[PDB]
Design an enzyme around this catalytic site. Structure first.
Site, PDB file in Angstrom:
ATOM      1  N   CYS A 160       0.861  -1.217   0.000  1.00  0.00           N
ATOM      2  CA  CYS A 160       0.000   0.000   0.000  1.00  0.00           C
ATOM      3  C   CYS A 160       0.871   1.232   0.000  1.00  0.00           C
ATOM      4  CB  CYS A 160      -0.865   0.005   1.251  1.00  0.00           C
ATOM      5  SG  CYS A 160      -2.045   1.403   1.293  1.00  0.00           S
ATOM      6  N   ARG A 169       6.995   5.998  -7.878  1.00  0.00           N
ATOM      7  CA  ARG A 169       7.915   4.790  -7.857  1.00  0.00           C
ATOM      8  C   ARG A 169       8.309   4.347  -6.484  1.00  0.00           C
ATOM      9  NH1 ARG A 169       6.623   3.069 -12.612  1.00  0.00           N
ATOM     10  NH2 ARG A 169       8.420   1.622 -12.469  1.00  0.00           N
ATOM     11  N   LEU A 411      -5.458 -14.211   1.783  1.00  0.00           N
ATOM     12  CA  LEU A 411      -6.263 -13.317   2.653  1.00  0.00           C
ATOM     13  C   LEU A 411      -6.363 -11.858   2.141  1.00  0.00           C
ATOM     14  CD1 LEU A 411      -5.066 -14.532   6.130  1.00  0.00           C
ATOM     15  CD2 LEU A 411      -7.083 -15.351   4.858  1.00  0.00           C
TER      16      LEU A 411
HETATM   17  C1  LIG Z   1      12.001 -13.541  -2.356  1.00  0.00           C
HETATM   18  C2  LIG Z   1      11.041 -12.552  -1.681  1.00  0.00           C
HETATM   19  C3  LIG Z   1      10.395 -11.619  -2.745  1.00  0.00           C
HETATM   20  C4  LIG Z   1       9.415 -10.679  -2.059  1.00  0.00           C
HETATM   21  C5  LIG Z   1       8.666  -9.694  -3.053  1.00  0.00           C
HETATM   22  C6  LIG Z   1       7.851 -10.424  -4.086  1.00  0.00           C
HETATM   23  C7  LIG Z   1       7.110  -9.478  -5.070  1.00  0.00           C
HETATM   24  C8  LIG Z   1       5.911  -8.818  -4.345  1.00  0.00           C
HETATM   25  C9  LIG Z   1       5.198  -7.817  -5.346  1.00  0.00           C
HETATM   26  C10 LIG Z   1       4.076  -7.118  -4.586  1.00  0.00           C
HETATM   27  C11 LIG Z   1       2.804  -7.976  -4.486  1.00  0.00           C
HETATM   28  C12 LIG Z   1       1.672  -7.172  -3.810  1.00  0.00           C
HETATM   29  C13 LIG Z   1       0.381  -8.000  -3.583  1.00  0.00           C
HETATM   30  C14 LIG Z   1      -0.707  -7.035  -3.138  1.00  0.00           C
HETATM   31  O1  LIG Z   1      -0.645  -6.493  -2.000  1.00  0.00           O
HETATM   32  S1  LIG Z   1      -1.966  -6.606  -4.249  1.00  0.00           S
HETATM   33  C15 LIG Z   1      -2.777  -5.198  -3.451  1.00  0.00           C
HETATM   34  C16 LIG Z   1      -1.987  -3.963  -3.950  1.00  0.00           C
HETATM   35  N1  LIG Z   1      -2.442  -2.720  -3.236  1.00  0.00           N
HETATM   36  C17 LIG Z   1      -3.363  -1.858  -3.711  1.00  0.00           C
HETATM   37  O2  LIG Z   1      -3.954  -2.072  -4.788  1.00  0.00           O
HETATM   38  C18 LIG Z   1      -3.724  -0.755  -2.790  1.00  0.00           C
HETATM   39  C19 LIG Z   1      -4.031   0.583  -3.546  1.00  0.00           C
HETATM   40  N2  LIG Z   1      -2.916   0.946  -4.428  1.00  0.00           N
HETATM   41  C20 LIG Z   1      -1.705   1.345  -4.016  1.00  0.00           C
HETATM   42  O3  LIG Z   1      -1.448   1.382  -2.779  1.00  0.00           O
HETATM   43  C21 LIG Z   1      -0.661   1.660  -5.040  1.00  0.00           C
HETATM   44  O4  LIG Z   1      -1.354   1.972  -6.262  1.00  0.00           O
HETATM   45  C22 LIG Z   1       0.358   0.530  -5.281  1.00  0.00           C
HETATM   46  C23 LIG Z   1       1.139   0.291  -3.918  1.00  0.00           C
HETATM   47  C24 LIG Z   1      -0.336  -0.790  -5.697  1.00  0.00           C
HETATM   48  C25 LIG Z   1       1.357   0.846  -6.425  1.00  0.00           C
HETATM   49  O5  LIG Z   1       1.903   2.159  -6.140  1.00  0.00           O
HETATM   50  P1  LIG Z   1       1.776   3.389  -7.197  1.00  0.00           P
HETATM   51  O6  LIG Z   1       0.481   3.224  -7.912  1.00  0.00           O
HETATM   52  O7  LIG Z   1       2.069   4.627  -6.476  1.00  0.00           O
HETATM   53  O8  LIG Z   1       2.879   3.070  -8.280  1.00  0.00           O
HETATM   54  P2  LIG Z   1       4.502   3.315  -8.141  1.00  0.00           P
HETATM   55  O9  LIG Z   1       4.836   4.482  -9.080  1.00  0.00           O
HETATM   56  O10 LIG Z   1       4.940   3.365  -6.731  1.00  0.00           O
HETATM   57  O11 LIG Z   1       4.971   1.940  -8.762  1.00  0.00           O
HETATM   58  C26 LIG Z   1       4.693   1.579 -10.105  1.00  0.00           C
HETATM   59  C27 LIG Z   1       5.055   0.146 -10.285  1.00  0.00           C
HETATM   60  O12 LIG Z   1       4.307  -0.710  -9.385  1.00  0.00           O
HETATM   61  C28 LIG Z   1       3.770  -1.785 -10.145  1.00  0.00           C
HETATM   62  N3  LIG Z   1       2.539  -2.231  -9.487  1.00  0.00           N
HETATM   63  C29 LIG Z   1       1.305  -1.605  -9.419  1.00  0.00           C
HETATM   64  N4  LIG Z   1       0.469  -2.326  -8.726  1.00  0.00           N
HETATM   65  C30 LIG Z   1       1.150  -3.439  -8.276  1.00  0.00           C
HETATM   66  C31 LIG Z   1       0.764  -4.539  -7.524  1.00  0.00           C
HETATM   67  N5  LIG Z   1      -0.483  -4.730  -7.020  1.00  0.00           N
HETATM   68  N6  LIG Z   1       1.680  -5.498  -7.259  1.00  0.00           N
HETATM   69  C32 LIG Z   1       2.916  -5.424  -7.778  1.00  0.00           C
HETATM   70  N7  LIG Z   1       3.316  -4.378  -8.558  1.00  0.00           N
HETATM   71  C33 LIG Z   1       2.438  -3.365  -8.765  1.00  0.00           C
HETATM   72  C34 LIG Z   1       3.456  -1.134 -11.481  1.00  0.00           C
HETATM   73  O13 LIG Z   1       3.225  -2.177 -12.489  1.00  0.00           O
HETATM   74  C35 LIG Z   1       4.765  -0.341 -11.668  1.00  0.00           C
HETATM   75  O14 LIG Z   1       5.848  -1.218 -12.128  1.00  0.00           O
HETATM   76  P3  LIG Z   1       6.228  -1.196 -13.706  1.00  0.00           P
HETATM   77  O15 LIG Z   1       4.998  -1.646 -14.421  1.00  0.00           O
HETATM   78  O16 LIG Z   1       6.572   0.203 -13.978  1.00  0.00           O
HETATM   79  O17 LIG Z   1       7.297  -2.254 -13.845  1.00  0.00           O
HETATM   80 MG   LIG Z   2       4.705   5.893  -5.556  1.00  0.00          MG
END
Ligand SMILES: CCCCCCCCCCCCCC(=O)SCCNC(=O)CCNC(=O)[C@H](O)C(C)(C)COP(=O)(O)OP(=O)(O)OC[C@H]1O[C@@H](n2cnc3c(N)ncnc32)[C@H](O)[C@@H]1OP(=O)(O)O
Ligand SMILES: [Mg+2]
Length: 411
Positions: A160, A169, A411
């Protein structure tokens, strides 16, 4: 097209996905010693914060961020309102790692800006059945079997960023730091879901909804009166009759789960989840944690007759804020969690889930077409909703599977 996701160890296209025939890592792992000891760099005016998600005031701070800035529909009518009790439950399972709960605060005013959370999961994620058959047909069984054993990985959720900081970003920064903290514990895969399309899902399922209080659902515009019901004198009265449920459960011997049921519920659940290609393995402590009843949070019933537990179901609660309606402020949703049936058909078990949820004041029951959830959709009057839940892995090549091969409830 993806300035962040194109830099990460995930399949980049469906074409690349189509070529994957065995489960295994994208990046062969390094070691913990290869991973930067220090936190990823962040703007000098922000700071990393690790909340304690067992301390009521830290849980509150994260609750407010999500309440006001977590997932909303496109028409900004509903926003998830996961409760403080639900967050403690979801984020602090047995052997959780506190350092996988990652937040960013504004230094000056100490404003919470962003959050992401990881929890441990033990996951079967080896090559799926239909690809093991293809490997057998070509003499490739040992390569297909290499990662058959359940693996101790990370599940990611609750990403979030505050609405004032969107499109700056910050989400890739949160993801890179969470990945570093997980890698510093010698874990190199994660599993996550999203309703949005990213590079590249290994499974996708439609959402389904079962109306429990259709009058409320239509008032808050979650639902409409379908056109077929306009040929009646009283369309709403007929819609209420269509979704009416008994007022008490129908299965003999249904009662709430208690601690003494943990070994039998573990045995029947694990035997059932074995039939799916991707699914969790739970210890007795994890069956206790995820399935014993918790007020307001998780609800679990067993069928016990003649001193033996033969079936069970669970559901959990996530309310949503209703933005701007003068009659209601919340949408009270019940989500189908784990279940197992050995003595009765699944539709008969799940009918009692709908009865209990309606008796307890839930407005709708939701699920995705994972597990054997397709087997009761028509009889129990579920309907598909808009959109799709996509399942992803981080750093794991995986052949595409149908959602009826997924047993992991997210969840
Ligand atoms: C080995 C361990 C590994 C651990 C990590 C594993 C990976 C975990 C990955 C996370 C799994 C999360 C599972 C859940 O919780 S899914 C629930 C996600 N949360 C929301 O939808 C809540 C409301 N929205 C927001 O809070 C923001 O819009 C979010 C935080 C979603 C993006 O913030 P913002 O809108 O301000 O954008 P930015 O400028 O910072 O960032 C832009 C970049 O973010 C990429 N983006 C957008 N949405 C998602 C999304 N849902 N999963 C992955 N990536 C996402 C987007 O394609 C772009 O990348 P690129 O297209 O340019 O490449
Ligand atoms: Mg941002």
């Amino acid at each position: 097209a993806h300035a962040f996701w194109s830099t990460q160890p995930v399949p980049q296209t469906e074409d690349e996905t189509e070529k994957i025939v065995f489960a295994g890592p994208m990046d062969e792992p390094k070691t913990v010693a290869d991973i930067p000891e220090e936190p990823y760099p962040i703007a000098s005016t922000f700071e990393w914060w690790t909340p304690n998600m067992e301390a009521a005031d830290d849980i509150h701070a994260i609750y407010e961020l999500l309440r006001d800035n977590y997932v909303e529909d496109d028409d900004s009518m509903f926003r998830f309102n996961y409760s403080e009790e639900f967050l403690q439950w979801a984020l602090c399972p047995p052997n959780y790692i506190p350092d996988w709960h990652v937040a960013v605060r504004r230094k000056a005013d100490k404003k919470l800006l962003a959050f992401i959370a990881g929890v441990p999961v033990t996951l079967r994620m080896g090559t799926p059945k239909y690809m093991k058959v293809k490997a057998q047909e070509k003499g490739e069984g040992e390569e297909a079997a290499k990662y058959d054993e359940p693996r101790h990985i990370c599940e990611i959720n609750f990403l979030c960023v505050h609405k004032q900081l969107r499109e700056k970003r910050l989400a890739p920064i949160l993801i890179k730091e969470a990945t570093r903290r997980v890698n510093r514990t010698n874990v190199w895969q994660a599993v996550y879901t999203a309703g949005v399309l990213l590079p590249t899902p290994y499974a996708s399922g439609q959402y389904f909804h079962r109306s429990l209080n259709p009058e409320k659902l239509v008032e808050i515009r979650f639902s409409g009166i379908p056109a077929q019901y306009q040929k009646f004198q009283n369309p709403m009265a007929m819609l209420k009759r269509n979704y009416q449920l008994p007022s008490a459960p129908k299965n003999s011997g249904l009662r709430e789960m208690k601690p003494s049921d943990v070994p039998q519920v573990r045995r029947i659940l694990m035997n059932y989840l074995d039939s799916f290609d991707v699914g969790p393995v739970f210890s007795d402590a994890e069956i206790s944690h995820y399935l014993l009843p918790r007020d307001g949070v998780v609800f679990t019933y067993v069928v016990e007759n003649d001193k033996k537990v033969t079936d069970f179901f669970s559901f959990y609660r996530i309310p949503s804020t209703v933005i701007g309606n003068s009659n209601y402020n919340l949408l009270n949703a019940a989500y189908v969690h784990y279940y197992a049936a050995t003595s009765i058909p699944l539709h008969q078990l799940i009918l009692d889930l709908l009865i209990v949820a309606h008796s307890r004041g839930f407005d709708v029951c939701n699920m995705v077409e994972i597990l054997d959830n397709r087997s009761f959709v028509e009889q129990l009057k579920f309907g598909a909703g808009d959109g799709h839940l996509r399942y992803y892995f981080y750093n794991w090549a995986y052949p595409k599977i149908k959602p009826s091969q997924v047993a992991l409830v997210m969840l």
